[PDB]
Every structure is written in structure tokens, then in C-alpha cells.
Amino acid sequence: LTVEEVLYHIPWLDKNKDYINFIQEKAKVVTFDCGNDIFEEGDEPKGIYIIISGMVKLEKSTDYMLSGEIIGEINCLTNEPMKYSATCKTVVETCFIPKTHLYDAFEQCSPLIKQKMWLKLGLAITARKIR
């Protein structure tokens, strides 16, 4: 509903109002038409997208992503080119955090946000192993 509410669901912001307030300063709602690419394999990472609504398909020249899922964490952490494309299979609404503002958050809010992003990715790996 609100950008605030979307940010409050990101695990690595840890429901911290100060961290969320900071991010919200440059977080933007970004909408894609059906069929649009958010990015292509090889692109430099621009930031983090949290899917609000719609369906995104990742392809490495086949994984689907839905509401609540986050795109771009690893690539923002390593600053390496994307290794897959993301194509919108419906109208897709996202909350976007630019990479530079994320890095600013690590310096001005807390370095622990970065550690929490790695944590989130580890637990996903582990969960995905079981599931």
C-alpha cells in the first residue's frame, strides 16, 4: 500500500524505523508494462527492486518472481554484472532503491544492513535446499 509498508517487509531493514525512514528518502515506486525488461544479462546493477505486484521471469541466455520478492541484492553487494535477464509477464509494480542510496545507508545508517542482506541470502539458500 505505502512505500513505508513495503520497506517494513524487507528482512534486512529489520523493521527499524530509522533505517526505513532513510531508505524512503530516495526509494521510488517504478512500474513496468507487460513484456518490458527490467534489465538484461550483462547490465551493471542499478539497485534493488521489491516486487509489489505482478510476475517477473528471470532468464539466463527460467525462474518466476512474485509479490514480496526482491531483485538485485547479490549484484548490489558484489557490484558484478547481472547474470540473467528479468522480463515482466504482467504489469509489474516495484519499489526501487538506487544502489548508491543503499551504499549510503551502509555508511550513514548501519553497516549491519549489509551483514543482514548476506544473512537473508544465506537463509534463502538453506531454505531453498530443503524446498
UniProtKB/Swiss-Prot annotation:
Sperm. It is found in: Cell projection, Cilium, Flagellum membrane. It comes from the Eukaryota. Belongs to the monovalent cation:proton antiporter 1 (CPA1) transporter (TC 2.A.36) family. The ion transport-like region is related to the membrane segments of voltage-gated ion channels. Its function is unknown. Interacts with soluble adenylyl cyclase (sAC). Sperm-specific solute carrier involved in intracellular pH regulation of spermatozoa. Required for sperm motility and fertility. Involved in sperm cell hyperactivation, a step needed for sperm motility which is essential late in the preparation of sperm for fertilization. Required for the expression and bicarbonate regulation of the soluble adenylyl cyclase (sAC). This is Solute carrier family 9 member C1. The lineage of its organism: Eukaryota, Metazoa, Chordata, Craniata, Vertebrata. The chain holds residues 860 to 1011 of 1177 of the full protein.
